Amino acid sequence: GEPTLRRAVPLALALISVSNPRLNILDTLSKFSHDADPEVSYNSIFAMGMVGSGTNNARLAAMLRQLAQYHAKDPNNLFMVRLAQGLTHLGKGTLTLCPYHSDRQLMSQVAVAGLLTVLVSFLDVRNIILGKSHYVLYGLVAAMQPRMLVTFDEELRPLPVSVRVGQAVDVVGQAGKPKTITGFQTHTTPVLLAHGERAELATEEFLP
Amino acid sequence: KTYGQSTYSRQIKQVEDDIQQLLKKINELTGIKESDTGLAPPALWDLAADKQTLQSEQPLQVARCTKIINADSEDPKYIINVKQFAKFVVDLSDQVAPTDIEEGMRVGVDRNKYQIHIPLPPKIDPTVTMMQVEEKPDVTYSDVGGCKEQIEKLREVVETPLLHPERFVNLGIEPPKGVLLFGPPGTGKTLCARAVANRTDACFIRVIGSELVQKYVGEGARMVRELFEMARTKKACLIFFDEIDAIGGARFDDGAGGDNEVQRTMLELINQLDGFDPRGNIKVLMATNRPDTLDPALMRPGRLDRKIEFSLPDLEGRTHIFKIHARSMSVERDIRFELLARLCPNSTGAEIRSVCTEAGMFAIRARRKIATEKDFLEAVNKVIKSYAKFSAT
Amino acid sequence: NRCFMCRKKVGLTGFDCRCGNLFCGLHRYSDKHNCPYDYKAEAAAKIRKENPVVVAEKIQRI
Ligand SMILES: Nc1ncnc2c1ncn2[C@@H]1O[C@H](COP(=O)(O)OP(=O)(O)OP(=O)(O)O)[C@@H](O)[C@H]1O
Ligand SMILES: [Mg+2]
């Protein structure tokens, strides 16, 4: 979720255009709540629930509006079916996610046949975050430093991997979509050095 | 004329360019209504121009803003002025709770019946809104190598009590909220400021020392009021001053007709700094080049507690700054910098960066990819002689 | 009006120590009357109330 589509979609969503089988734009209501779990979009979903209380009848949408309202804020984390891992490669995410969106054409496939898929259609979400130590005892809390996704491909040799160096954590935190955090102090990230949320932390004093 | 630097040189260039222009020609071909004196493009407000603007029309009235004075007993019975219109005894609408309507508050009230509708955020003027940085530059502590004692002393003050308010309780002490930096220019104070602001984790507030002197009396103080107000509001916020010499350096009175207004303002910074109900959770970082001509009232501890200075690197600070300003650049694998710093007995980190960037200018003018190591040799030579027979030196 | 560490009558030049007792100018100091109060604990408690536990922006909401 970003402001571009996050605003452009409700430009066709708040205006439902209910002359159609309006539960298509209401279907899009649901999976427009598909963004990075929690966000300031509760203003949007909440307001569209207020205007959607009477209008956009609850006879067919009362499950839908709060359905999308609650999807972001389910355990407050754990959305990974993006067919992306590490930085950009692939990984299932389609057998389980896709049949929902194919199952969402318009109507009474939300009535009888739909309730089997629509609830537990996609469940291939692999947690969320990477703040973890896993030094064999698993006691470490090594100093991390959350930032923005690494935007760098080739500029020079002394080139900064991320920009949002402000935040600094040590333990279980927030992965987020554009994040490629590294850390510092060289407490020794020798295991993989390519991220992945269960690093082993082979410890060593490499001239700190 | 020219040559093909990389194989299909124009073959990617014009191919990119003509489709870039075709992006425009698509837009003007389809028809785009541009330059309608401050509106939005119709592609996105056509499906927003509907009654889901009347939802902003009728549900939300004009909501004229006003200011609260006081309340009464057993009931709101609020006394309010508008701004210059008139003062009324009005009451809140039923949409509000009679708790967060405390006095001195900017509140939105109906235009028709004059009933309070909304509590508002208080007023804050742009002149100080703009000095709040609202952003953290990327300045890592490692970039300020060569001042290990200083960065440690500052670390003990602006960092350790905040991120670890545990030791000071387990021993029962209070941190020295007042830090002053000084020393020769071009040395690592600004850098320290930006780096501390990097990991500030706090409402860091810049202050430019000359911004306070003004044309009218007391208005600069009125700034200071809003400063310590936004400070006390924003819990755990930092303040930086810079070249505070303009404020209150002396109390020149032999012929008492010189500078007085910024003396009064300096007094306001005195009171609102310490005295009568201290501030709480605030930290003050200053820095000047001539910390010698200042009013001793600021020199009193409690306000200006620590006096950290940045010196001139003897031989090795210049080496490490060669490692700082020479690292973020392209050079051959044949580096060596002790030979360099042994050649510059007296030079600052700023001059170090001047030699590092001046190193690139040779290959830059000599049509080269990178600053070769030997080219960096030539750079230090021209800066050894340049700094040897320098204009001012 | 009198002190407790030496019974020397004073009047208006007496003192009101935290321990509820009046002293003369010689005995006003807590080390001249063995004050039985935990100044250190009221320590660890005032600094804890005035010290704002800063929070690095992390693990906020949902
Ligand atoms: N030890 C150092 N390491 C890296 N860079 C340095 C060092 N010393 C000086 N510099 C460079 O020289 C410049 C001058 O440093 P700085 O701005 O901290 O001095 P200043 O005291 O703020 O200047 P002035 O006294 O003129 O206000 C900086 O921009 C910095 O990049
Ligand atoms: Mg400076």
Side-chain angles (χ1 to χ4, degrees), chain A, chain B residues 1-46 48-49 52-66 68-110 112-393, chain C:
Chain A
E2 66 185 3
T4 62
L5 80 165
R6 186 179 295 276
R7 276 71 175 175
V9 172
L11 292 172
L13 265 287
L15 275 295
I16 296 90
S17 297
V18 299
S19 297
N20 62 9
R22 76 281 191 188
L23 276 296
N24 54 3
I25 301 298
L26 277 68
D27 183 71
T28 65
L29 186 158
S30 67
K31 295 293 94 178
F32 180 68
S33 297
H34 194 273
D35 297 331
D37 289 345
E39 244 353 305
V40 70
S41 177
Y42 180 79
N43 188 0
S44 298
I45 307 300
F46 181 73
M48 189 172 183
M50 187 65 204
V51 66
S53 64
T55 63
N56 298 115
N57 297 115
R59 300 292 184 183
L60 293 174
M63 186 275 291
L64 187 150
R65 282 81 58 90
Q66 291 182 356
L67 184 66
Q69 180 66 263
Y70 300 154
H71 174 72
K73 74 113 74 307
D74 37 357
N76 299 318
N77 58 1
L78 190 142
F79 71 100
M80 199 63 213
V81 287
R82 190 179 291 113
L83 279 296
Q85 285 295 115
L87 188 150
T88 185
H89 65 270
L90 194 63
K92 201 31 62 225
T94 60
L95 288 75
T96 318
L97 188 281
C98 182
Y100 181 78
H101 294 86
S102 178
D103 189 75
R104 294 297 85 191
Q105 221 346 88
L106 224 329
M107 293 183 73
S108 176
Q109 183 63 43
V110 303
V112 171
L115 281 75
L116 276 296
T117 300
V118 65
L119 278 73
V120 297
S121 179
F122 59 97
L123 295 171
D124 287 335
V125 174
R126 306 175 351 299
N127 245 38
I128 186 161
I129 63 170
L130 64 85
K132 287 181 182 293
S133 298
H134 292 86
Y135 181 74
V136 176
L137 187 151
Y138 186 73
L140 275 66
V141 299
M144 293 181 287
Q145 191 272 119
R147 291 179 291 172
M148 184 61 73
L149 192 148
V150 292
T151 62
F152 66 94
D153 198 358
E154 72 272 15
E155 290 82 3
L156 72 161
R157 356 238 268 236
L159 110 83
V161 297
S162 182
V163 62
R164 182 66 273 173
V165 68
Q167 285 72 240
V169 298
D170 57 354
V171 77
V172 297
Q174 181 66 40
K177 187 267 187 295
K179 280 80 178 175
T180 308
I181 296 90
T182 62
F184 63 94
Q185 180 65 41
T186 308
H187 165 91
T188 72
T189 62
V191 177
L192 71 166
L193 189 65
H195 310 148
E197 73 190 1
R198 189 176 296 118
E200 181 66 26
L201 291 180
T203 189
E204 185 57 25
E205 289 82 3
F206 277 149
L207 184 63
Chain B
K1 278 74 68 178
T2 187
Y3 61 91
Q5 292 83 17
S6 181
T7 61
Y8 55 98
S9 182
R10 61 92 179 267
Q11 183 62 256
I12 199 173
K13 183 265 291 179
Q14 65 184 356
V15 171
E16 182 186 0
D17 186 74
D18 60 355
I19 191 65
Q20 291 178 353
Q21 183 61 255
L22 181 62
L23 189 150
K24 289 173 90 291
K25 301 291 94 175
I26 293 167
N27 290 318
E28 288 95 13
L29 182 61
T30 61
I32 188 166
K33 295 179 179 66
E34 293 295 328
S35 296
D36 60 358
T37 185
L39 275 301
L44 74 159
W45 60 265
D46 192 1
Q52 286 72 240
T53 57
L54 284 73
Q55 297 295 323
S56 64
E57 293 293 329
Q58 291 83 21
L60 275 297
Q61 292 82 16
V62 68
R64 182 177 292 171
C65 69
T66 58
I68 298 170
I69 297 170
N70 60 359
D72 291 331
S73 296
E74 293 177 353
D75 285 325
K77 290 183 175 66
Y78 291 153
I79 297 169
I80 296 167
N81 57 358
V82 177
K83 183 179 291 295
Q84 63 182 356
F85 182 74
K87 296 182 290 295
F88 295 95
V89 175
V90 299
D91 189 359
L92 56 87
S93 66
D94 292 331
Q95 295 178 355
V96 301
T99 61
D100 294 331
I101 308 169
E102 294 177 353
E103 298 178 356
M105 186 181 291
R106 298 178 66 191
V107 296
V109 174
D110 182 75
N112 191 1
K113 298 294 179 68
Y114 292 167
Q115 64 183 356
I116 297 169
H117 289 173
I118 295 169
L120 276 67
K123 180 67 176 67
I124 296 168
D125 60 357
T127 181
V128 304
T129 301
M130 295 301 292
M131 63 184 72
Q132 182 178 2
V133 60
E134 294 179 353
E135 293 178 354
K136 294 188 287 184
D138 189 0
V139 174
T140 301
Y141 293 155
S142 177
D143 294 331
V144 191
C147 295
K148 298 299 293 295
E149 294 178 353
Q150 292 80 14
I151 297 170
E152 183 61 25
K153 294 182 181 180
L154 187 149
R155 182 67 58 81
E156 183 64 23
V157 178
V158 179
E159 182 66 19
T160 59
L162 294 174
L163 284 75
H164 295 88
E166 295 178 352
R167 294 178 178 89
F168 291 171
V169 176
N170 295 118
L171 196 152
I173 61 171
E174 294 175 353
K177 298 179 184 177
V179 175
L180 188 151
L181 281 72
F182 63 97
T187 311
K189 305 180 189 89
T190 291
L191 292 174
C192 295
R194 295 180 181 177
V196 176
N198 188 1
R199 294 178 64 191
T200 185
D201 192 77
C203 297
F204 179 75
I205 297 169
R206 185 271 306 278
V207 174
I208 295 170
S210 296
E211 291 179 351
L212 293 175
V213 177
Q214 295 176 357
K215 183 174 87 276
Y216 291 160
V217 297
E219 181 62 27
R222 296 179 62 87
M223 299 294 172
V224 179
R225 279 74 176 270
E226 294 292 327
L227 273 67
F228 290 95
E229 291 297 328
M230 294 182 286
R232 294 180 181 272
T233 61
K234 294 178 181 292
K235 66 180 292 295
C237 64
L238 298 175
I239 295 171
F240 182 76
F241 294 164
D242 198 0
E243 294 92 10
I244 54 89
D245 298 331
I247 299 169
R251 186 174 291 173
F252 291 164
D253 293 331
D254 191 359
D259 190 0
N260 296 115
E261 65 180 2
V262 187
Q263 182 66 42
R264 278 85 59 84
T265 299
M266 181 269 176
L267 298 173
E268 187 65 24
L269 180 61
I270 287 170
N271 204 168
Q272 292 182 356
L273 180 59
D274 284 330
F276 183 71
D277 187 5
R279 63 185 184 179
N281 296 114
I282 301 91
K283 301 297 187 291
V284 170
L285 295 174
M286 294 180 186
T288 190
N289 297 116
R290 59 182 296 167
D292 184 72
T293 62
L294 278 301
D295 190 358
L298 294 174
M299 295 298 173
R300 182 179 64 82
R303 295 179 180 174
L304 295 176
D305 293 332
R306 291 179 183 268
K307 302 293 181 68
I308 296 171
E309 65 183 1
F310 294 162
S311 178
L312 184 62
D314 50 356
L315 282 75
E316 292 81 4
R318 292 188 298 271
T319 66
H320 182 72
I321 300 167
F322 290 163
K323 294 181 181 180
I324 299 170
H325 294 163
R327 61 93 180 267
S328 177
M329 63 182 287
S330 295
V331 295
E332 187 178 3
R333 298 292 182 185
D334 292 331
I335 67 171
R336 75 280 192 190
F337 293 99
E338 183 180 2
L339 188 279
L340 321 305
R342 295 179 66 253
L343 297 170
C344 293
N346 297 118
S347 66
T348 65
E351 295 178 354
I352 289 169
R353 190 269 299 162
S354 69
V355 177
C356 295
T357 62
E358 183 67 25
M361 293 298 290
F362 295 97
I364 291 160
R365 71 185 69 186
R367 273 67 168 176
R368 184 176 294 170
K369 296 184 289 293
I370 30 63
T372 305
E373 286 293 323
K374 182 176 175 65
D375 192 1
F376 184 77
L377 275 68
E378 297 295 328
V380 300
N381 294 121
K382 186 178 77 68
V383 302
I384 285 170
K385 302 297 187 292
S386 296
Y387 293 162
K389 65 180 73 66
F390 183 76
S391 178
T393 65
Chain C
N1 317 44
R2 214 191 278 222
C3 187
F4 178 77
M5 183 66 75
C6 69
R7 301 180 180 185
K8 208 192 265 200
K9 313 245 288 117
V10 256
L12 282 326
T13 19
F15 243 172
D16 55 304
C17 190
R18 282 250 183 219
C19 65
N21 283 292
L22 250 72
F23 299 95
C24 67
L26 276 72
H27 303 111
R28 167 227 323 178
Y29 304 94
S30 178
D31 230 49
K32 266 67 231 288
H33 88 326
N34 289 99
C35 217
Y37 182 89
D38 286 305
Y39 297 91
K40 293 181 179 178
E42 152 204 14
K46 181 170 292 193
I47 292 164
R48 194 189 305 168
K49 185 177 178 181
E50 240 178 0
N51 192 31
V53 245
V54 211
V55 281
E57 190 38 296
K58 103 181 270 182
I59 308 190
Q60 8 57 69
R61 4 154 21 54
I62 151 192

